[PDB]
């Protein structure tokens, strides 16, 4: 997207720890117009925590 | 995106179980050109399992 400058360095860390970041988190991050690196990381991380939980939810199905 | 017909129904189930589906999973799903409902669901689910795991990975940082 239209990516910032330190954001890009935090993203490069995850890439270096073989973590794939969900593009959903990319979106919400650019909208935060955060100024740091510590700020960025703490934010992606909150989001990973979040997305870990959402993928855990148990689905209700008229299926099986 | 260019969305299918039964896919859309499985997507509607998750929406009905207040599960937000990562758009990454939407992408990979359309590329599967899967024909069912059972097929679709079993696929999204494998993907949720996967994404739950990726968001769990522990990051390595020159930060803290």
From Swiss-Prot, chains A, B:
It is found in: Host cell membrane. Changing residue 51 to A: Loss of dimerization. Loss of DNA-binding activity. It comes from the Viruses. The record marks 55 as: Involved in oligomerization and DNA binding. Residues 5-64 are annotated as: DNA-binding. Belongs to the phi29likevirus gp16.7 family. Homodimer; homooligomer. Interacts with DNA; one dsDNA binding subunit is constituted by three p16.7. dimers. Binds to the long stretches of ssDNA of the viral DNA replication intermediates created during the protein-primed mechanism of replication of the viral genome and attaches the viral DNA to the membrane of the infected cells. Required for the redistribution of replicating viral DNA from the initial replication site to membrane-associated sites surrounding the nucleoid. Required for the second pull step of DNA ejection. This is DNA replication protein 16.7. The chain holds residues 66 to 129 of 130 of the full protein.
